[PDB]
Scaffold this motif. Structure first.
Motif, short mmCIF file in Angstrom:
data_model
loop_
_atom_site.label_atom_id
_atom_site.label_comp_id
_atom_site.label_asym_id
_atom_site.label_seq_id
_atom_site.Cartn_x
_atom_site.Cartn_y
_atom_site.Cartn_z
N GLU B 16 0.82 -1.21 0.00
CA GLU B 16 0.00 0.00 0.00
C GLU B 16 0.85 1.26 0.00
N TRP B 17 2.03 1.24 0.63
CA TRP B 17 2.92 2.39 0.56
C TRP B 17 3.42 2.61 -0.85
N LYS B 18 3.76 1.53 -1.56
CA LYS B 18 4.14 1.66 -2.96
C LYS B 18 3.01 2.27 -3.78
N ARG B 19 1.79 1.78 -3.57
CA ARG B 19 0.64 2.33 -4.29
C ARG B 19 0.47 3.82 -4.01
N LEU B 20 0.46 4.20 -2.74
CA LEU B 20 0.21 5.60 -2.38
C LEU B 20 1.34 6.52 -2.83
N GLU B 21 2.57 6.03 -2.90
CA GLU B 21 3.65 6.84 -3.44
C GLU B 21 3.58 6.95 -4.96
N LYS B 22 3.04 5.93 -5.64
CA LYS B 22 2.91 6.00 -7.09
C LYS B 22 1.85 7.01 -7.50
N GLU B 23 0.61 6.82 -7.06
CA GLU B 23 -0.50 7.61 -7.56
C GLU B 23 -0.75 8.88 -6.76
N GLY B 24 0.31 9.64 -6.48
CA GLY B 24 0.22 10.98 -5.92
C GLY B 24 -0.88 11.25 -4.92
N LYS B 25 -1.12 10.31 -4.01
CA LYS B 25 -2.28 10.41 -3.13
C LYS B 25 -2.07 11.46 -2.05
N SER B 26 -3.13 11.69 -1.27
CA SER B 26 -3.14 12.74 -0.27
C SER B 26 -2.25 12.37 0.91
N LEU B 27 -1.99 13.36 1.76
CA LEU B 27 -1.21 13.16 2.97
C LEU B 27 -2.01 12.50 4.08
N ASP B 28 -3.32 12.37 3.92
CA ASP B 28 -4.15 11.69 4.91
C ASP B 28 -4.24 10.19 4.68
N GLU B 29 -4.22 9.75 3.42
CA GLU B 29 -4.20 8.32 3.13
C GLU B 29 -2.93 7.67 3.67
N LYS B 30 -1.79 8.35 3.52
CA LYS B 30 -0.54 7.82 4.05
C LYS B 30 -0.58 7.71 5.57
N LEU B 31 -1.12 8.73 6.25
CA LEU B 31 -1.23 8.67 7.70
C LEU B 31 -2.19 7.57 8.14
N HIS B 32 -3.27 7.36 7.39
CA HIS B 32 -4.19 6.28 7.75
C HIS B 32 -3.55 4.92 7.56
N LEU B 33 -2.77 4.74 6.49
CA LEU B 33 -2.02 3.50 6.31
C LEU B 33 -1.06 3.27 7.47
N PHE B 34 -0.33 4.32 7.85
CA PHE B 34 0.63 4.19 8.95
C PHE B 34 -0.07 3.86 10.25
N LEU B 35 -1.20 4.52 10.54
CA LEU B 35 -1.93 4.23 11.77
C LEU B 35 -2.47 2.81 11.77
N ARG B 36 -3.01 2.35 10.64
CA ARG B 36 -3.54 0.99 10.57
C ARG B 36 -2.44 -0.03 10.83
#
Ligand code: ZN
Ligand code: ZN
Lengths: 90, 90
Positions: B16-36
């Motif tokens: 999921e980190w690879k996905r979120l770094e690829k498709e220019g996603k928001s800074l909240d999706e990354k934080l939600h992934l990290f929290l999960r």
């Protein structure tokens, strides 16, 4: 299969909440349970399961505020606000 | 079987980190992934896999600080503090 995922998440939450309640296992463990289930249901993406989670999190926020923990309250309130915004946008 | 659950959690985190770094996603999706992932790793019983998450969350908080969001940095800082305290107690 989304409904099955929601049912499994809610069953895990119910069992963990029941075990924690018939104990004295601090407010931090309860908040961690709520956050874990909230993130699972956000990755699922279903309403009508996050609104009851929001209500129970408000109950926990009241419990924390009546106690003397000022750092747990900020995390609880941030989680509540974030879940509210996600529900509004969902 | 603890190591297998840790491996599954880290596999989900990496993909999921690879996905979120690829498709220019928001800074909240990354934080939600990290929290999960942080909550899942906290729930099993793992250290030495939570310090790398602390490092990456510190980098993410550095990115958030120079972005312009103030109500999103408090959640990241609170998560970092809680994970650090749990690591110390673990
Ligand atoms: Zn969010
Ligand atoms: Zn904690």
């Amino acid at each position: 299969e989304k409904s099955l995922k929601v049912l499994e998440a809610l069953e895990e939450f119910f069992k963990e909440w029941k075990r924690l309640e018939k104990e004295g296992k601090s407010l931090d463990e309860k908040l961690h349970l709520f956050l874990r289930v909230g993130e699972r249901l956000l990755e699922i993406g279903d309403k009508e399961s996050l609104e009851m989670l929001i209500e129970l999190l408000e109950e926990l926020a009241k419990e924390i505020k009546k106690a003397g923990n000022e750092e747990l309250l900020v995390r609880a309130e941030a989680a509540i606000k974030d879940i509210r915004k996600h529900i509004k946008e969902l």
